[PDB]
């Protein structure tokens, strides 16, 4: 997170850190608890991941330094990629992790709420991008989960800022005209969360953008409302 500030234990109970164990263990992506066995993240996170055996989902983590070799983690039973995904910049950058074991809920780890498909009419005014990623191009993973507040921008203005790419309706953009606050390396797959009527909703999934916090170049996020039906098809399987 560029231009962001540190969070406190329990502030973003749905943010999780998604690790890979090969060749080394390393933080790979943000992700969001959406149910007692479901993590919503970005499909791009799994380029080069050939088996869910090498994934560790870590919840209730405020500091990356909390993780050591005996720390509990949730195994990933299954990876569900949207069948039309090919690139981040081409949309469909959504993915579900079905975990091997149930998640208990507490002040440190709690699910976040999907948008209601009848509430696209909503203009969110309190939105935050969160993650352990860089605050700086060519940096390192930040230790303490960072937060930054950013205004959503219209798809019209996001399109004007991104000639050459098609900004589909299933994408959503957010950033300050002058730059300075944005996600960056490591934050992808994390949430863009928005407080509405005292209820947090998972409005977007960090997915791509030109560099980081560059002025007149907002961040692009998978527009989560446009896939709610899709999510349910996978999470209500019979």
């Amino acid at each position: 997170i560029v231009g962001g500030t540190a969070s406190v234990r329990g502030e973003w109970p749905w943010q999780v850190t998604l690790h890979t164990t090969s060749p080394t263990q390393r933080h790979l992506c943000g992700g969001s608890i959406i149910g007692n066995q479901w993590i919503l993240t970005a499909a791009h996170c799994f380029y080069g991941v050939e088996s869910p055996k090498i994934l560790r989902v870590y919840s209730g983590i405020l500091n990356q330094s909390e993780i050591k070799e005996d720390t509990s983690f949730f195994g990933v039973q299954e990876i569900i990629i949207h069948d039309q995904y090919k690139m981040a910049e081409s949309g469909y950058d959504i993915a579900l992790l079905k975990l091997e074991t149930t998640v208990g809920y507490g002040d440190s780890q709690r699910p976040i709420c999907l948008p209601s498909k009848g509430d696209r009419n909503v203009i969110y005014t309190d939105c935050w991008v969160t993650g352990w990623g860089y605050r700086k191009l060519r940096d390192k993973i930040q230790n303490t989960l960072q937060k930054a507040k950013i205004p959503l921008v219209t798809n019209e203005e996001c399109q004007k800022r991104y000639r050459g790419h098609k900004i589909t309706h299933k994408m959503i953009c957010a950033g300050y005209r002058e730059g300075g606050k944005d996600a960056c390396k490591g934050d992808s797959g994390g949430p863009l969360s928005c407080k509405h009527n005292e209820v947090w909703h998972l409005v977007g999934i960090t997915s791509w953008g030109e560099g980081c916090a560059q002025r007149e170049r907002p961040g692009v996020y998978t527009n989560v409302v446009e896939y709610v039906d899709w999510i349910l098809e996978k999470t209500q399987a019979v």
């Binding site: 790979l28 791009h44 996170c45 981040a88 910049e89 990623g133 191009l137 790419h165 944005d182 996600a183 960056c184 390396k185 490591g186 934050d187 992808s188 960090t206 997915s207 791509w208 953008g209 030109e210 560099g211 980081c212 961040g219």
Partner: peptide, 10 residues
């Protein structure tokens, strides 16, 4: 970096 649009990924 290869793709300026993937600086916030990997």
């Amino acid at each position: 970096c290869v793709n300026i649009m993937c600086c916030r990924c990997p």
